[PDB]
Amino acid sequence: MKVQYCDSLVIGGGLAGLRAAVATQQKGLSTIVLSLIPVKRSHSAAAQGGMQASLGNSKMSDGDNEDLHFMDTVKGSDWGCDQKVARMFVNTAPKAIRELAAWGVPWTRIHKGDRMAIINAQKTTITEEDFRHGLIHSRDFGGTKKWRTCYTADATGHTMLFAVANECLKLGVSIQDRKEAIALIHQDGKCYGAVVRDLVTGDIIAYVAKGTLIATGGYGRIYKNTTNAVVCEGTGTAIALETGIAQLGNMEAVQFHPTPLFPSGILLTEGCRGDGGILRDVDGHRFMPDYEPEKKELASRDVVSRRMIEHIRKGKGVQSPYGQHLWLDISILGRKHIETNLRDVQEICEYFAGIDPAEKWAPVLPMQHYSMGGIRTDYRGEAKLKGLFSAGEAACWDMHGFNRLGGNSVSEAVVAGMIVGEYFAEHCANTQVDLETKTLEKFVKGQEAYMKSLVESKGTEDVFKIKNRMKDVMDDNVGIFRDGPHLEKSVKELEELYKKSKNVGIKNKRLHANPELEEAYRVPMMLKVALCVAKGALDRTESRGAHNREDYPKRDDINWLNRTLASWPNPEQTLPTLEYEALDVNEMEIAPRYRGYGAKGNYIENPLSVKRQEEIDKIQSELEAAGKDRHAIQEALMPYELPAKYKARNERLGD
Amino acid sequence: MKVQYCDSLVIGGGLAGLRAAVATQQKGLSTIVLSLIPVKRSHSAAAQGGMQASLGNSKMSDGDNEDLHFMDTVKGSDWGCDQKVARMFVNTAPKAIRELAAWGVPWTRIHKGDRMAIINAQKTTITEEDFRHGLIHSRDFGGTKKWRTCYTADATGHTMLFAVANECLKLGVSIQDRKEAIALIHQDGKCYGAVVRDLVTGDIIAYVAKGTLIATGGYGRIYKNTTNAVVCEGTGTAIALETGIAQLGNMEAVQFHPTPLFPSGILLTEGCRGDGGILRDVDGHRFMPDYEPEKKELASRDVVSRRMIEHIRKGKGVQSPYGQHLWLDISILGRKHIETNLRDVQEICEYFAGIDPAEKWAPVLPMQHYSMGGIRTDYRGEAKLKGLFSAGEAACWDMHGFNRLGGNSVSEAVVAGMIVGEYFAEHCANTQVDLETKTLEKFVKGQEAYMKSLVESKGTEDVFKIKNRMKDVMDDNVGIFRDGPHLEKSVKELEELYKKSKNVGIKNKRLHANPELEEAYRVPMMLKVALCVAKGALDRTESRGAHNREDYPKRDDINWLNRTLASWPNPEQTLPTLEYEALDVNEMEIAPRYRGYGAKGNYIENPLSVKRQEEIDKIQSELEAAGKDRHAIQEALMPYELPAKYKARNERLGD
Ligand SMILES: *Cc1cc2c(cc1C)nc1c(=O)[nH]c(=O)nc-1n2C[C@H](O)[C@H](O)[C@H](O)COP(=O)(O)OP(=O)(O)OC[C@H]1O[C@@H](n2cnc3c(N)ncnc32)[C@H](O)[C@@H]1O
């Protein structure tokens, strides 16, 4: 048998995984990072919008702080998040930005002077004073009143990922690519590592560690239309689920993006850098003002996606061989001034859409984009399976609830990498494990036998058409608008699809470097993940955040102010087991109310929300009278934990 | 922490260790071989005499079989060996030779024709028939009536070692050199591996395995004068001893060689290939005929060593700056015929002694040569510490008792590698271990702290003079002739030496590639090994095999027909704990009697020996009358075990 040992095993080489590896390696814990691909090619590298952090450097960031960022996050989550985790996040984001700056990330900086446009109306000139010069700049992104999205020109995710990966190399972290975790080794409710398949040689290897962290990203690829890389298939989520003990949280909470290029899914950051992009229908008609007279195209992205679908169902969409879509027109610009970098989007359209934005319109359609759901953890990042941690998009640490704030996800990846990294390191240093060879051999030989059965299978099903059928079902029935009848049917077909995946047969019999063998074991995993999303969507009879039930259009704070927990106890069951974790209103710093976007008064009020709200109002007014600061008032409303390393305050311009 | 795992851990890259690694690796068990030096430089490579195996190919080997080889072995051991183990050995030796032949070992072959000399007297012409042509040849070595020592010209150990090492490379055995095992990891009476120090980088690493085998060779270097390589220091024996559970067997049983070059210890195989070498004293007098009128120089090597010491104590030795010695004269030859290879010894004398044998005489003195003693195991090669095996000179499997048969040791290395290899493989495949990180960390950090204390020690003792003082004490008091008074004093000085070794201080403070640090931890280990030998020699009040007590000149089969078992239970004690394992006369195929060499009737007879002897005589005569064969008679006298793979009979010329 082949066995590799390390003190801290990290599964996933994205921003979250690499940052967590830095935390453990810097304290002498031997650490290995496993990844399907070279870590610098992870999906994190595609982030072009930016990272959210309340620095308060620029004019449009003036007066920003943890409280304001916290509020935007909670309301955005439509009260589905763990508010304490959100506090840990907003408080730590500023220091994540600054640490990366010290690591060389070339953040765009502020320079003295005036700027034009970049505003909805009224004002149009921005002035950056001399004392702001040279500090990290910010842009308007995510729809927050205060501009706090930091960026390194047009490749933020890329420069961030490279810096964290370089730090790993500097520290001597062991990075092993083209290696895939296909199962978790566990016994007596404890995780002792993972069974790994070497994608090149085909060897099945056991990686044992005192602690294991899963930072495998999202599961967007279960949908046909997604912005996600080809590797975001949710297998990290699946192996966690297949332990029969670790639980998945809010898998039904999927976020879409309104303007990806159709049908590729390639992101056109059009209308971002400089608002001007106009959405048009089949008649060239600018429809957004018809649904949103005030906000128009600048409405909440959440709203824009819905309106685009509504307009298409109204029969005003453009027909094409790949389905219906709409138009994105930016030609209305095609020129400006200079003094800084502002030229990219055209290339995307020319290289793929095969056209110049300044001339023709780009085809677009809302597509899957982010996965709020993931492995359920406590505030420390540990799952119900002891010794198993998770961070990043792969987790449901839950600072996102039912709607992630634009710019908060790449931020969570690094922030969670820092925080969960500390708790993960602590666990790995203090815990003591019993590594039984009997258990190791069982899991290892079990996967070798599994690989052999797949290669020897005389099944007649085709893995590719089963995977494609799954993606269609998810897109057609588990998208922006959902209803019981269709969810019912999708769940039924997915379950049927899952049973057929077990009768797959492949042509290539080799055990090494086999793309076909890879699909044969990954698809069944993706189907289990899909079932959790679909079934979770069917049973959740309410509309919350990105989850919209046309048959239950209102947010039900009485029966659904909770979190969906999915598990798969019996390896033979064909449907996930769903449970619910209720959110304690008393443990909230901000009581449930209007989320700030979408229709008004569209939620069933919970008597306790009113009760808690009054208490909050009272507790604040009093302490505020006694001349107590926001830090003391926050602590009185909802105390939260932070590891020693990060409990310091964040210095801001003009304290 | 750094941890390496494998199914089978082999400590020692000599003939025994490498052959055992082949046995485990060939059955899919991942195996690692640890060695201080590149394996092909192990002491096994110095063997020039040959390997003993009853092939029965040549004229002078005619009629040889397992029984004859068995008898020579038992009588040679002076009844101190486990006769069942000896049976396993002689039966398997023929197949070890043949397997090596299939592996390319260039054994010298027989050719049709006549040969001269190579005889004591009477006959002088040997004829090899045509049906013997092309088969593996044999020479006169070890004093056995039947010539059964196989050889590849003048470099038998070398070609054998290379072939076994090459087979390891072929199978992909993981060979890690410049790596030293400094402690064994154990818990609840089970061995889970070893703590290893990387001689190059200085890293302390834990190698864990389901089974661990120690094949680290002899401990000849505790003596000042030895034929052994500079690395035969007994540290493998020591780490076994320091577990407080594994036991050492007959450590006092040390064999000397009569004619190594003085004072280097370089072996002069003079008088071997072609008898002619004459021993002379300070007056040029040929003294051997004075003590042994009949056998003269051709007497048992055991006897020659004693006479040489006697002659020196008689004041007829040669004085030199390095001590007293005698002369070896081969000039009496310096010429012959041809038809085969016969030229080497001269070079040894010219390159080191700086002289031509055909002219001047070579200085010689008996020196330590072989270690019968070693780690005590059962017939399977497993020690009292479960999961810990041992094979080769490092073990006391005990087929040697108190006197190894010339040519049997290189034979045991390979044979034990084959047999113990099978049992070791079986153990590794069937056992299941509980690897606790708490236990691993304890042993690893314990050795790191130990290394740190050595480097930080402000002690004033000099490790080199303490090691040199030890070697002198061993040579002066624990040599060919021993007596209670001197052994008493040596044990006392060794114990005192051991206490001072703990107050050593070194100049070079680095943790990597540090020769001085190496001595600081190896010397204390050597001292514990020396103490076992010395104390074992003092308490054994009898003369047996190579162990000679001038105050107890007789072999006592009544009170000492047993084996000395040494242990070190309390890590704080300064003297080993000695126990005895009695040899059951009823479990013997050959009852105790005259060993065949040395003075007649020099042993206290045991009433049970006579009882058992009669029973043997009876059981044989009867079964022989019934026309039963030697195989059936042997089984009726003393049945023994052999793994399935080697229980077949050995085909011989003319069956
Ligand atoms: C898709 C996307 C997302 C995105 C964005 C633009 C695009 C096109 N722009 C963003 C922005 O401007 N601001 C923002 O806040 N977020 C933005 N996002 C989303 C964001 O980039 C992601 O949420 C974030 O990068 C996720 O980081 P994370 O570290 O969690 O994960 P990752 O980068 O996807 O990497 C996953 C790693 O896991 C390895 N892996 C996966 N499965 C396995 C298995 N089974 N075994 C071994 N390794 C595995 C992958 O190889 C990878 O390295």
Ligand SMILES: *Cc1cc2c(cc1C)nc1c(=O)[nH]c(=O)nc-1n2C[C@H](O)[C@H](O)[C@H](O)COP(=O)(O)OP(=O)(O)OC[C@H]1O[C@@H](n2cnc3c(N)ncnc32)[C@H](O)[C@@H]1O
């Ligand atoms: C010294 C000698 C012995 C000898 C001989 C000639 C000389 C000069 N001629 C012989 C002959 O003609 N016929 C015969 O039957 N025997 C003869 N012998 C004795 C014989 O060669 C030995 O008994 C035999 O070769 C021993 O083999 P074994 O496999 O047991 O051991 P080795 O070759 O000495 O190798 C020991 C290995 O252990 C490694 N080692 C030692 N300590 C450690 C620690 N602490 N950690 C890691 N590795 C360790 C050594 O590096 C080596 O590889």
Ligand SMILES: O=C(O)/C=C/C(=O)O
């Ligand atoms: O619109 C974008 O380019 C990125 C959005 C994201 O933060 O997910």
Ligand SMILES: O=C(O)/C=C/C(=O)O
């Ligand atoms: O006399 C020799 O060369 C070797 C003797 C040995 O077998 O130990």
Ligand SMILES: [Ca+2]
């Ligand atoms: Ca998630």
Ligand SMILES: [Ca+2]
């Ligand atoms: Ca021995």
